[model samples]
Target chain A: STSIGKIWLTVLFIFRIMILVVAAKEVWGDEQADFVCNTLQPGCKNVCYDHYFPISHIRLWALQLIFVSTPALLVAMHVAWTYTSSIFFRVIFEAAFMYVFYVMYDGFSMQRLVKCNAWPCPNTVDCFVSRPTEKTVFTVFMIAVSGICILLNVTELSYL
Target chain B: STSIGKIWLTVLFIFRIMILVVAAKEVWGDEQADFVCNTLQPGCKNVCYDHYFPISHIRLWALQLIFVSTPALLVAMHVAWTYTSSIFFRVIFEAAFMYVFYVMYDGFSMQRLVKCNAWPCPNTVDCFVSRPTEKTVFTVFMIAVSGICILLNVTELSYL
Candidate 1:
C-alpha cells in the first residue's frame, strides 16, 4: 500500500512537471508576440484579467516555480517519516537534484532589460544581441530538449 | 516559525538534490568518459571511485529534477493537511511540473548512449567520430555549459 501510494504520487508529480515545461515555452516569450497582454509597458493594464488566460510560456514557468519541486519535497517528508529505510540517502539525493535543476533553469535568466521607445522611426544596434528569429530558433531547440528529457525520465520511472 | 520551517525544508531539499545530480552525472556518459569502475574487462574493478564522487552529467540531471520540482510536493502536502483550502490550482500546477521534469529526464534514457573509446584506443578511427576537432570542441562546450548550469542553480536557489 505504501509503495502504491509512492508510485501514484510520483506519477502525479510527473504529470505536473510536464505541464510546467510546456507552459514555460508558451508564455516565456509571449511578451514579444502577445500584444493584448503586455507584461511590460507602463500604461498597459492586464488585458487578460477578465476573460483571458495565460499564454503557455508563463503558465509552464509558473507551474515549475509553484509545483514541480514536489518529489524532493517528498523526500524531505520521507525523511521526517519514522520507519524509513532510505531517509539518509533519499534526503541527500533530493537535495542534490534540486541544485542541478535550479542551475539549468538559471541558464535563461535575464541580463540587461532594455526599454524600447521609438522602434519604427530610428534604427538601434546596441539594445539586444540577436534578432527574434535567433531567439525563436534557440527557444524551440531548448523546449525540444526539455521534452526529450521529460520522456526519458518517465521511462526510467516506469510511467510508460 | 512555520515560515522558517518551510525555508529550512526548502534549503535542505535543494542541497540533497544537488548531491543526487552529481551522482547522476557521474553515472551518465560513463562509457564515454573515464568511468573505469563499471568496465566489462575481467581484471577491472571498483577502485578509485571517490575521485569521481563529486558529480557527473546523469547525477547533475537527476539533482536538477529533484530540486526544481519539489515545491509542488510540499504545497500538496500542506493542502492535504488543511483539507478545506482549495488546492485545485496548486495541485494542477504540481502535476504539470512533475510531468515536465519526467520528460526532461527521459532525454538521458538508455537508448541515446554516447560511446567514447577515445582514451583507451580500440585501434580504429571508428571509435571517436570523424572530426576530432569538432567532437573535442563539442565535448568541451557541453562540459562547460553543464558546469555553468550547475553553478547557476546553486547560486539562484541559495539566493532564493
Candidate 2:
C-alpha cells in the first residue's frame, strides 16, 4: 500500500508540476503567446498596460511549487537517505500542512479578470481566461493526496 | 532553550485559551458563548443573510481552539504517555496542519455585517462586534510559536 501510495503521489506530483507550468505561462505569457494580452487578447489591450494581478492566484502558484517539490522530499527521506528519524520527514510534512492551511482559507482570486478579447475593463468577452475551478479542484486534490500519503507512510512505519 | 521554549509554549497555550474563551463569548453571546452564533449561524443559513460578519475572525477563533488543544495532545504524547514512537505524534501533528490548511483559505463568513455603533457598511461600529485584529494577531502568534517550537525540537533531536 505504501508503495502504491508513493507511486500515486509521484504521478500526482508530476501532473501538478505540469499544470503549474501551464498556469505560470498563462500568468506570464510566452514567446508564442505574447504579453500584450492572451495571444488572443491583442485586440483588447493594444497598449500592453500591466494590470495588477490578485494575490490569491500567486498564492496558488506558490502552493503548486510546494506540491511539486514535496514528493521529491518524501522520496529523499524514505529512500535516498533511508532517514530513520521520525522528526525529520515529520517536520517537513507538518510545515507543509501549515502553509497549505494558511493559503486555503481565504485563497481565491478576488480581482475580476478581464477577457482581453473584450479589449477593456467593464468587459465581457469570454476569451483568454484561466479556469479557477481547475485551480481550486487541484488545490484540494493536492492536499488530500499529501495527507493520505503521509498517513500511509506513518502507519507503515508503525509496523516496521 | 528547550526548557525555556517549553515554558514559552505552555504560557502561550494558556494565553491562547483565555483569548479563545473571550472570542467564543464575543461570537456566541455570553453563556451560550461556548456554542452557537459560532455554531448556530452555520445551521441557520443556507446562503448569505447579510450577517455582516467577517469570515476571517471566525477562522481565527477556530485556529485558537486548535492551537490550545495541540499542546495538550503534544504533552500527552511526550510526557503522560511517554510516547517514544515517532509515528504517533507525527501523525497527529501532520493531521493538525492539514486541518489548518483546509480551513485557512476561503475561510471567511460570506454574510456582510453592518456595524451599528459606527454606522455605514465600510464604517466601523465599536457597538457589539468582535475585534478581528486581535484574532489575526493571535493566529499569527500561534503560528510563530508552533513553527519555532517544532523547528527547535527537531534541531535538538538531531544534535542528540
Candidate 3:
C-alpha cells in the first residue's frame, strides 16, 4: 500500500543528489570565471553580474533540495519510530517547493544574453551566461521531477 | 464557525475589485504610452518593451484574481447548495494562487529602469516603467492580503 510512497521518497533522494553532483558541479562550474562583460569600470562587471544573476542557480537549487528533502527525512524518521503516521508535511513541503520554483522562474530561466545599464557601465553591456541552454535543460528537467513528486505526494496522501 | 472563511472570501473579492479599479487603472494606466526608450528602430521599442515587461501587471493580476476568486465562488455555491461542504478545494486553490504569485514575482516587481540591448537599439537604451514605486506598494499589499487569506483558509479547514 505504501510502496508508492517509498518509491517517491527514493526518487526524490536520488534526484537531489544527482542534481547536486551532475548539474551543480559540471554545468555551473565556471560562472564567475566564464562570465564575460565588456565594461572595464570598477564594480561594473560585479554589479552587472549580480544584476543578471540575482541568485546563483546552484545555490537556489541547493536550498530547494535541502528543504524538499527535509520532509522526506522526517517521514523516514516517523516510519522508523512508529511507521507511516504523517505524510501531511510532505504535501505541504512539496507545494511550498513548487511555489518557490515558480517564483524564481525568471532567475532559473538562464538567459544566454543579458543587458546591463547600471552605473559604472558607461553604456549597456551585453553580458553572457555560460551554458545557458544546458542549464535550461536541467532546469526544465528539475521542474518536471518536482511536478511528479507533488503528484506522487498527493496520491500518497489520498491513500492515508 | 465558518465566519472566518466567509470573511476571507469577502476580503479576497473586495481586494480583487479594489486592485482592478485603483491600482490597475490608476497606477499602470500609461504603461505603453509612458514607456520611454531612446531608440528609433521600428521593432526596437516593441521588442525591448516585451522583453522587459514580459507580462503586464494589470493582466497578470487580473488572471490571478480570477483564479483566486474561482475557489471562493465555488465555496459560496457549495454553501448555497448544501452549506459548508467541500472546503478542501479552497485550500488547494489558495495554494496554487500563492504558487503563481511567487512564480511571477519578477514580472510583478516593476523596475523603474530596465536596460535593453536586444537589437536595433544601437546601444543599451534605458526603458522606464510607469510609477514603479507605487506599483511595488500595491504588489506588496496584495501579497500580504494573500498571506492573510491563506492563513484564514487553513484555519477554516482545521475547523472542518
Evaluated at residue B45, the lDDT of candidate 2 is 23
Q: Which clashing pairs does model 3 show?
A: A102-B103, A103-B102, A103-B103
What lDDT would each prediction earn against the true structure? 0.35, 0.42, 0.68
Error of 1 at B154 (Å): 36
Q: How much TM-score does chain B earn in each model?
A: 0.26, 0.44, 0.77
**DockQ per candidate, 2 decimals:** 0.01, 0.01, 0.06
Candidates arranged by lDDT, highest first: 3, 2, 1
TM-score of each: 0.22, 0.29, 0.46
* Pairwise TM-score winner, candidates 2 and 3: 3
Q: Best to worst by TM-score, what's the order?
A: 3, 2, 1
lDDT of 1 by residue, A36-81 (tens): 3223422122211111112222323332333335345554564343
lDDT by residue (B1-160, candidate 3, tens digit) is 3575686578677976786786566666677788766443466668887876677656766766777666656666663434334455555665776676567656456677888877566566666667788877777777677777778867766752
Q: Which candidate is the best by TM-score?
A: 3
| Candidate 2 Cα outliers beyond 4 Å, as residue runs | A27-82, A86-91, A94-104, A107-134, B1-160
Q: Model 1 fnat?
A: 0.00
**Which tens-of-lDDT digit does each residue in B87-108 have in candidate 1?**
2332333344434534543332
Residue-level lDDT tens digits of model 3 in A15-89: 767876876777777878888764435677788888766776567767667776676576666634243344565
lDDT value, residue A34 of candidate 3: 84
